[PDB]
A paper describes a structure:
In [name], MAL production depends on the [name] amidase and its binding partner, the [name] [name]. [name] removes the peptide side chain from N-acetylmuramic acid (NAM) so that PdaA can deacetylate NAM and catalyze lactam ring formation to form MAL. Amidase_3 family members are Zn2+-dependent N-acetylmuramoyl amidases that use a Zn2+ ion as part of their catalytic mechanism. While the functions of [name] and PdaA are conserved between B. subtilis and [name], we recently showed that [name] [name] amidase activity depends on the [name] [name].
Author numbering:
A (entry chain A), B (entry chain A): 22 to 114, 119 to 195
C (entry chain B), D (entry chain B): 40 to 236
Write the structure that this text describes.
Amino acid sequence: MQKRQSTKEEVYKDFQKQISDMNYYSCKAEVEVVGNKSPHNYVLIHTYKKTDNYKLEVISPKHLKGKSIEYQGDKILVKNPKISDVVELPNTGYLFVGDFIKNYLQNEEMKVKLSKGHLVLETFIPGDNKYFNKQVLYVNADTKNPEKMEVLDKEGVPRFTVKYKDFEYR
Amino acid sequence: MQKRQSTKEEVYKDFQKQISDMNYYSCKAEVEVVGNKSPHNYVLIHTYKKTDNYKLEVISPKHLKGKSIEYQGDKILVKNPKISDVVELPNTGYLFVGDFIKNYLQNEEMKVKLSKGHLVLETFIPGDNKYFNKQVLYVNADTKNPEKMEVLDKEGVPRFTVKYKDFEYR
Amino acid sequence: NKTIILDAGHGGIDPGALNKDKSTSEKDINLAITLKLRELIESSGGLVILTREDDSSLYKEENNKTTRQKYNENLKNRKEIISNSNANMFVSIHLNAFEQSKYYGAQTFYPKDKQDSKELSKCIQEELKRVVDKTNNREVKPRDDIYLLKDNNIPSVLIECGFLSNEKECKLLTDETYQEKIAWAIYIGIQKYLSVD
Amino acid sequence: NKTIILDAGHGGIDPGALNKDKSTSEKDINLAITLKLRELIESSGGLVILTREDDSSLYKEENNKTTRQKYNENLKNRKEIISNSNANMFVSIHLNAFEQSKYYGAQTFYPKDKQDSKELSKCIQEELKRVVDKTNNREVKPRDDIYLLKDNNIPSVLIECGFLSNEKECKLLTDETYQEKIAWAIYIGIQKYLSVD
Ligand SMILES: [Zn+2]
Ligand SMILES: [Zn+2]
């Protein structure tokens, strides 16, 4: 036997959940357009991807205040508003130091340690650069928000230290 | 009393879930950079939004084959590769006919009907354009994939009919 | 979500201008460019109102049969299509021809003293220059003698795509690929004009 | 994830070139532009190796004290910083000065017959033109007499940002905002060069 027929609202809410979680879709669209004369037909391909957008804007060192870098897709926007300059560059492919989603999400070979109220996550940085050797992220074990990140050289010295303040998300 | 301490893997998986569902985050980043001399300090604001990217490419009417429109952010890309032309236009704000996520997701005043194996969703198109009056989407009640969409004029005549073929999603 | 009137100037018994040897006419080229432009706009989610979809003229055979009367009735009927449509915009596609064969270039016109139409015309003229012929330095010109552009309440422009009087341009204008290029330029001009506000 | 050597040409007892009245020197302007550029690169996730961070020269007081010896030791020490760094790139910031005051403009150089460095130099020269002075039509020039650019195994360029010999340019070069503009141009040039491959 089989379950009972879904009601209007059950089917509708299932549809809402299905399209909300969608991160990619693709389809063929056959479109009929009817003006004041003969209809006309078109075929399109529709593609949807949900994509990441990162903006880093510098505030503190006065020289840099208001300068920004924006990562959108295959594109990067580098902005100096002090002279109204916008430069567009191609994205080859961590997108910046401080970028933690999708490297600490998409787990690989990785050291995980629970120490003094922090989830410590360590990965090696491929390319065996003497200076960008290992990436270490400290996550608050209660909030699960990142607290600190260190790029260590091959001798274990932090070359970049990011301290995350005022972290909010939706 | 209170629950037991989470293990390494429980905290780590909670963190993965939290950052995966993130659609927006914002924080202040205090960065220390240490070259071969004195360290230097910077303060940046990091902003992340997960954003929609739509591409419509025309295949069928030979004249239009390979022409495309891409919706990214505040930007729209209109491409005619037959002459290697790319035009960038500003996005003012359904993004195209056939766009159904985020209007049939974000419910408003809306007619929902369960008829002959289809979830029928009807909304009015604001602006009281004689020609773009009401938007009707037919969803397959089993797959929850959209099957058909009609833009009806004020007299109920379909002016645009989109039939969705080969629908796949992730 | 715009509705756009495209008017292929001429039709039926009314050819347009003609080439030197009268092989080639406005009717068919205007219709060709207009139908290319219709496809561009509709595939982008705009709705197109056509004055003509084929080689016909907007008059009925009552056998009064004055060619001037046929022409006048054609124009009145196109005007009523403009009046009764609730469209957002009107674009008329013609060609030019002068006794002097040295003249060439696409030229846009707008009805005198209508600012919106002047802006639209400028957008289209800029795209005609950039896409079709960077040589062309023509500027948009006002008109006050084109009936179909007078007093429409919507942005209204006429585009004379080239000169049949010019042999190189005439040969280009009979080419389906050149016609598509022109339609592309006009479509982009419309889109820029609409993106501003 | 690049590591970049920035070399503020001169320091300590070694000023660079001087203005007509010897008020203004290379040392301080080079250091200023280099530190602006350091901030641009580091805030973008690059690591900067400096030859000098302040007004000093890379030699030790052994009281042999030949000014030519001091200069030579300075150059050898900068060379060792290049050799031992495992950096991806080396950029040297200087200024020029000639007896003729009519000369002006930023000029980039690359070591003769090194293709990568020529490409980088071209990127920086294009940005110096576009950002700082559209008037400037200087082309990148090869050199084979700059020790610090010889045989480095990494892309290596020298930038002479302007002429102290030219009164208008000298006044500009002492301005912190103009210095930041130059740093911006160099930073963008580097970034374009790196975005290609
Ligand atoms: Zn005509
Ligand atoms: Zn020097």
